[PDB]
Ligand binder design. Sequence first.
Ligand SMILES: Nc1nc2ncccc2[nH]1
Length: 158
Amino acid sequence: GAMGASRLYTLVLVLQPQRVLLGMKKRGFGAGRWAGFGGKVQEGETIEDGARRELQEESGLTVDALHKVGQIVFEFVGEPELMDVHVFCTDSIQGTPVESDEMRPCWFQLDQIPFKDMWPDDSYWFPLLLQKKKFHGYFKFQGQDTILDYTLREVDTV
Ligand SMILES: Nc1nc2ncccc2[nH]1
């Protein structure tokens, strides 16, 4: 039948030449895993404006240019609504990251990406982000640990 309906999300990675900023999710779904900063796009908001707002809310950072780098769709067994995640990168930030109720920011060297404490799908697409390639992905999860199906492709546009 028809693809499930999807909810629009953003995800921002501050990626510098030798390190990347992640945040430890402190509560709710995905707590205990390092992730980029993001959340649901609000009514009337552009995707990029939502990305900037979520970055500021969760990490305290404001940034200049955000670059579109990929799109990931997540599906969970037992939930009909999908997550449509628009992924952005930036390399130039203004200020110091600050812990929020949602996220504890932390820098990681690029030879110390904490995959064991990240979502399982990151093993597949996060390397593409690091290579500066654009991608579309889809992952179907049983619970929080098990991937039942996934697709991933590199693209020139997205
Ligand atoms: N990397 C990543 N973030 C996620 N958020 C929610 C569900 C699955 C996820 N995979």
